């Protein structure tokens, strides 16, 4: 599955650095490199990178079809 | 309170089992299903203590004095819950304040497998770098698609949160206390019972099972609710219910 992340809070930073906020059940992100879980089943997941750049918002923007 | 009357023996991921009944405590949470999805700990016959993030509802059942919860002819009390009192303060985005109360239906039956934790005050100092236990039927290996059927243990080091927040960072917070990075680990299915170190001769509820790494890494820190900050709001709802 291809990267995205919802909720993108970059910060103050030159070069960017970002941090998302997304909750996922069972894992993270497919390209996270550090992710937290709560112990619970499901797990409630959290990706604690920092990146200079977001992934797509997940979701599409839903804006393109009426004039 | 915390005076088992089956004493543990200390010689999860690479934890051990427990001594059956030697954490009379400790209660599994089941969904209508009886699917273990957390656990919890017994303060007094009729309260509960679990993680926020575990979404405990009153379709819920608390199940006391379970060993192996593969067996049939294990003599457990299966309690429904009246009301959940969910820390209005649990922010599920940082995970902080991660406590829940569960107000039981009728009172526990208190016997040698099934008895209270003692509960520590705001002021108690648990040191860094004391052992404590924490107990859970989470899984033994992250891979794993099977909890275990008994009652696991493991013992580990309080860490500072000034330590902790080496491994993460601005994550911790003053209602968390991290334990372990010490070669065992909580792992999914511990949420919510107990971190327990031994205060005057008492087991004492010092954390609660909240998170950590997403494969249960035993190179880092397990972090917990940590129950003297949140202990005197957990003393008023029970003094208020």
């Known amino acids: 599955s291809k990267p995205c992340c919802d909720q993108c809070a970059c910060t103050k930073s030159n070069p960017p650095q970002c941090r998302c906020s997304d909750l996922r059940l069972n894992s993270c992100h497919s390209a996270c490199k550090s992710c937290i879980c709560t112990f619970s089943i499901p797990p409630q997941c959290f990706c604690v990178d920092i990146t200079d750049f977001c992934y797509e918002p997940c979701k599409p923007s839903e804006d393109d079809k009426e004039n | 309170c915390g005076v088992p009357a089956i004493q543990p023996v200390l010689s999860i991921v690479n934890g051990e089992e427990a001594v059956p009944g030697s954490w009379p405590w ?94 520590p005050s705001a002021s108690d100092d648990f040191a860094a770098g004391t052992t404590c236990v924490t107990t859970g039927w989470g899984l033994t290996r992250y891979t794993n698609a099977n909890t275990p059927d008994r009652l696991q243990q493991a013992s580990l080091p309080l860490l500072s949160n000034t330590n902790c927040k080496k491994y993460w960072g601005t994550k911790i917070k003053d209602a968390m206390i991290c334990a372990g990075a010490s070669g065992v680990s909580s792992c999914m299915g511990d949420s919510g019972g107990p971190l327990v170190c031994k205060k005057n001769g008492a087991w004492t509820l010092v954390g609660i099972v909240s998170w950590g790494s997403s494969t249960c890494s035993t190179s880092t820190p397990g972090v917990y609710a940590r129950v003297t900050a949140l202990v005197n709001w957990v003393q008023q709802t029970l003094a208020a219910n």
């Open chain 2, 26 to 119: 400790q209660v599994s949470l089941q969904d209508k299903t009886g699917f273990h999805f957390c656990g919890g700990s017994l303060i007094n016959e009729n309260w509960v203590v679990t993680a926020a993030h575990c979404g405990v509802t009153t379709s819920d059942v608390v199940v006391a004095g379970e060993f192996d919860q593969g067996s049939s002819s294990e003599k457990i009390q299966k309690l429904k819950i009246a009301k959940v009192f969910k820390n209005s303060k649990y922010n599920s985005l940082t995970i902080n304040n991660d406590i829940t109360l569960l107000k039981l239906s009728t009172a526990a039956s208190f016997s040698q497998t099934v008895s209270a934790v003692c509960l």
